[PDB]
């Protein structure tokens, strides 16, 4: 629907500017001239700027000749120090070309956005090639991951090829008939979930970005991917359920919960996600529920939080020492979020925290340790270590209680 | 028969498969052409609004296309209240695309339902959103409603003044926003305020595209509101003699 | 009243619901022109869900009341139905298989007319209505009215054999039921012509839909051996 | 509180009098600002920690309540702090639509 609603008249000012500026007979700007402007030894951003700015005025029908030069040279736009307006206008022109010339534009655009270290890199990514394996479009040069216009382009491509692949393999299984439908549905669900996971991993800050600065290209790409995932979840919430059952790196949970308004449906299946055997899935469920409770503080959210507290208290006395550490290290920062969402949980949260603190203290007492936290019973506050698991878990319990008390007190 | 054809087309709408649904939706205007019976038109548009509320985005856009095409028939709607109420419910959707489609729907329906305050507030709210698709839809709907309504016109005039004066708005959105002012001809004082705004615009935004758009909008406003035509002609002659740009001169000629 | 009964007959709460439906649908119309009538009717329908259901049942009962009123109210029902009247069809099935013992003859004829209209229009869920109406035919009986009803529904099914074709299970249900009717019916020249029509239709279905007739079961052979 | 409850009952009985009742609540808020704001969180039904569902705009009784609250809040500066985000949104809606009733 994005391409169709793009065609919709907004105000008609574009027609006015068409009739006014294009009448200058500056239409001497030709694809060969644009290609020459791109291939200057210096960057020479002025000439390409003027040409593509002029091309914005061109109607979609006559803009077809410029498809080859714009797509072929968009790899050069990844270089450092390219002006933003160049990429913005390229995005606008690509959207226009997509509105009138979708399929071959997609084929040539994917062929153009190859990593380029492999040079040709199998330029035979035909229409069928992408239609069978939509994830090819994600196999692109790393620089697009922090280039918001071309990233938006790639997201459009990815959505289109997911739907195209669905219809394609449906048609293929129909014609090859001469059960398999279950395998079709499973393959489609797996493909959509895999696309979602790759996008989420793109949203992660890399090590260099890890090496504050909340306004950058990464935030723009995160917003774009969040919008696309919102569209996908609206299209099929079962994909959201499958992705969350698969889980993903918990650093994204604030980002994903804040940027995907359809995420509120997660409270429906979180009770069933909790009941999975895998410890990792339960940990992820607790973290997800904590972020949602921060976001949406609803009675159903409170009931699911009560269930979360009860299961954490339950399997506190089912897990071994190593399992206790591995489970309660990530899910303890969720308790402060639960306290923030729901004051009526203070009783159960504090009772659970006391029980786990005494269990961990006894566990510390069983074996000789380095720090011996029990004798350090009168320590002060310490805001922000390869020690043994139990003292780490005790310090984590301490920090959880510190955060809860500090936020409630102020 | 009219009703027979109507329900035989309706069973396609209920088919579930998207192809038959959009087929029926775009089949609707032909049925209006065959049977300009206000009973049938009212019932058909109610069904359209129901499927618009419950259907996905593509089906909503199809219903938008149908509403735009079936402009001549929609003044014969009996239950305008229920129709617009169930249409308006989609505006609360978190999906920005659905909100944009609903804003465009309201803009198409502006002829039969002006002076509807909740619709006006929805237009005003979306105008300051973040999703560019929703903002453009809000601009289109604002154009239509300001063409129809009067109080909405002065409210949007004030909002556009404080928005263009603001720095958050990008240049392209400012270009899209200016021709809204061509509908401020509902009364003399509103037109004069719009004239002051356009004077401010041409003074403080001297680049080619927006002086083009702004002085063309001023020309249309002066044409509609005959009170300010002499000063508009004087301003056009001033821009013709003084401004050096060829494009601005050619627009002055036109 | 509508359903034949006497003083001793129990006050049927379903029939009282139908009477309340009569009250709301008629008193709201007030004999005004259809335009404002359907305007107000749509307003009342869109007010809420139970009143929507009440209006739908009132339209359904009016379809069983009088011919001209049946035409106008079926028009209005097709114009004002929101969900396509699927739960309305469910209530039609319930009223049908429950109250057919007491249904008046004119109401029977008008209900048959409504069934034909629904089948011709291809409204969704009509297969359920067809197979539950089919179920009410009593085997091993020779009452004139029942045989007339069987012939009428047979005529409906024959003219809309394509609608049977797109309804896979209904093919098997119809062919089995008509074979049972064939082994039941004999004796008169009119019944002989009816027999000819039924056997022609059944042979055509069996040849054209042999694969679909596979799931009927061994009792198909049991019907075959008698004919 | 009794005045408001009986006025809402009157709204249910005789909705055509909605404009006059809104005028009533306008004058009630303006002439009794301090006495209203202790009753604000009950009137808006705001929960201590939950986020209440957005009330149905264009409803008669809710508009009546909002008119009373806003006209109470014209003089009092502590009143708007108890408003949720949708209450501000509805304030903007009412202010543009019913400027003669709802003050700044």
């Amino acid at each position: 629907v994005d391409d169709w609603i793009c065609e919709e008249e907004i105000t008609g000012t574009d027609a006015l500017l068409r009739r006014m500026l294009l009448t200058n007979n500056a239409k001497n700007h030709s694809p060969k001239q644009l290609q020459e402007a791109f291939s200057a030894v210096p960057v020479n951003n002025t000439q390409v700027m003027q040409i593509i700015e002029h091309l914005t005025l061109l109607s979609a029908s006559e803009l077809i000749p410029y498809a080859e030069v714009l797509t072929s040279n968009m790899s050069q736009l990844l270089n450092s120090g390219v002006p933003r307006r160049i990429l913005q206008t390229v995005n606008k022109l690509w959207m226009v070309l997509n509105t009138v010339m979708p399929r071959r534009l997609w084929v040539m655009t994917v062929n153009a956005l190859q990593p380029s270290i492999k040079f040709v890199r199998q330029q035979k990514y035909t229409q069928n090639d992408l239609m069978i394996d939509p994830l090819i479009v994600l196999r692109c040069d790393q620089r697009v991951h922090r280039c918001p216009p071309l990233m938006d382009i790639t997201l459009h491509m990815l959505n289109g090829y997911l739907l195209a692949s669905k219809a394609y393999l449906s048609a293929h299984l129909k014609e090859t008939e001469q059960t398999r439908e279950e395998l079709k549905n499973a393959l489609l669900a797996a493909q959509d979930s895999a696309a979602v996971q790759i996008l989420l991993e793109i949203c992660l800050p890399t090590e260099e970005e890890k090496a504050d600065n909340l306004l950058c290209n990464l935030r723009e790409v995160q917003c774009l991917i969040c919008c696309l995932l919102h569209q996908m979840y609206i299209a099929d919430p079962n994909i959201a359920k499958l992705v969350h059952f698969q889980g993903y790196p918990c650093e994204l949970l604030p980002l994903t919960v804040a940027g995907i308004p359809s995420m509120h449906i997660c409270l429906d299946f979180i009770p069933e996600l909790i009941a999975q055997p895998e410890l990792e899935k339960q940990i992820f469920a607790i973290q997800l529920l904590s972020h949602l409770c921060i976001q949406y503080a609803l009675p159903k959210s409170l009931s699911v939080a009560r269930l979360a507290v009860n299961v954490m208290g339950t399997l506190l006395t089912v897990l071994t020492q190593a399992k206790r550490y591995a489970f309660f290290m990530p899910t303890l920062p969720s308790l402060v979020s639960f306290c923030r969402a729901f004051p009526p949980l203070y009783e159960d949260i504090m009772s659970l925290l006391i029980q786990i603190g005494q269990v961990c203290a006894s566990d510390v007492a069983t074996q000789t340790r380095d720090i011996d936290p029990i004798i350090t019973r009168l320590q002060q506050i310490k805001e922000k270590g390869s020690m043994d698991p139990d003292v780490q878990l005790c310090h984590c319990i301490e920090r959880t209680v510190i955060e809860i008390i500090n936020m409630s007190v102020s | 028969d009219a009703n027979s054809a109507l329900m035989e087309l309706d069973k396609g709408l209920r088919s579930g498969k998207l192809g038959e649904q959009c087929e029926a939706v775009v089949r609707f205007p032909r049925l209006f052409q065959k049977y300009p019976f206000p009973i049938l038109i009212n019932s058909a548009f109610l069904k359209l609004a129901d499927v618009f509320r419950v259907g996905n985005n593509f089906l909503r856009l199809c219903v938008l296309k149908v509403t735009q095409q079936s402009e001549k028939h929609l003044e014969k709607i009996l239950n305008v209240d229920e129709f617009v109420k169930r249409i308006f419910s989609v505006i609360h959707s978190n999906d920005p695309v659905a909100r944009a489609i609903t804003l465009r729907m309201l803009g198409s329906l502006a002829s039969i339902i002006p002076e509807r305050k909740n619709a006006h507030h929805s237009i005003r709210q979306s105008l300051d959103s973040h999703d560019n698709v929703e903002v453009e839809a809000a601009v289109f709907a604002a154009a239509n409603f300001s063409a129809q309504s009067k109080d909405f016109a002065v409210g949007i005039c004030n909002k556009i003044s404080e928005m263009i004066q603001g720095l958050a708005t990008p240049v392209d959105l400012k270009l899209k926003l200016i021709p809204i002012l061509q509908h401020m001809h509902h009364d003399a004082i509103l037109a004069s305020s719009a004239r002051q705004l356009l004077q401010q615009l041409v003074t403080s935004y001297p680049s080619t595209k927006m002086v083009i758009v702004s002085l063309h909008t001023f020309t249309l406003l002066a044409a509609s509101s005959l009170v300010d035509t002499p000063k508009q002609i004087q301003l056009l002659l001033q821009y013709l003699k003084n401004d050096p740009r060829k494009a601005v001169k050619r627009l002055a000629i036109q | 009243r509508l359903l034949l009964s006497t003083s001793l007959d129990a006050k049927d709460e379903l029939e009282e619901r139908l009477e309340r439906c009569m009250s709301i649908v008629t008193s709201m119309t007030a004999g005004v022109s259809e335009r404002e009538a359907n305007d107000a009717l749509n307003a009342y329908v869109c007010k809420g869900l139970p009143q929507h259901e009440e209006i739908c049942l009132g339209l359904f009962t009016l379809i069983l009341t009088e011919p001209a009123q049946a035409q106008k109210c079926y028009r209005d029902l097709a114009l004002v139905s929101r969900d396509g009247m699927n739960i309305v069809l469910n209530k039609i099935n319930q009223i049908l298989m429950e109250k057919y013992l007491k249904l008046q003859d004119t109401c029977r004829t008008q209900l048959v007319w409504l069934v034909r209209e629904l089948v011709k229009s291809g409204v969704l869920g009509a297969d359920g209505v067809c197979m539950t109406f089919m179920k009410q035919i009593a085997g091993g009986d020779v009452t004139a009215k029942n045989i007339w009803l069987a012939e009428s529904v047979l005529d409906i099914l024959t003219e809309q054999r394509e609608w049977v074709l797109k309804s896979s299970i209904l093919i098997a249900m119809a062919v089995y039921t008509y074979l049972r009717l064939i082994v039941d019916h004999h004796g008169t020249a009119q019944l002989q012509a009816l027999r000819q029509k039924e056997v022609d239709f059944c042979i055509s279905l069996l040849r054209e839909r042999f694969m679909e007739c596979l799931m009927i079961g061994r009792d198909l052979v049991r019907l075959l051996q008698n004919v | 509180h009794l005045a408001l409850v009986e006025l809402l009952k009157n709204l249910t009985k005789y909705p055509t009098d909605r404009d006059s009742i809104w005028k009533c609540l306008k004058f009630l808020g303006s002439r009794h600002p301090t006495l209203v704001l202790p009753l604000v969180p009950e009137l808006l039904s705001t929960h201590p920690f939950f986020d209440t569902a957005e009330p149905d705009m264009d409803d008669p009784a809710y508009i009546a309540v909002l008119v009373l609250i806003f006209n109470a809040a014209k003089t009092c500066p502590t009143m708007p702090a108890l408003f949720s985000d949708h209450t501000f949104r509805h304030y903007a809606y009412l202010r543009d639509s019913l400027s003669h009733l709802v003050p700044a």
């Binding site: 979840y233 | 419910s89 978190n94 | - | -």
Partner: peptide
């Protein structure tokens, strides 16, 4: 109902 936030108005028919 993923297209509507839980704290949005409910369209009661």
């Amino acid at each position: 109902s993923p297209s509507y936030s839980p704290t949005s108005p409910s369209y009661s028919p």
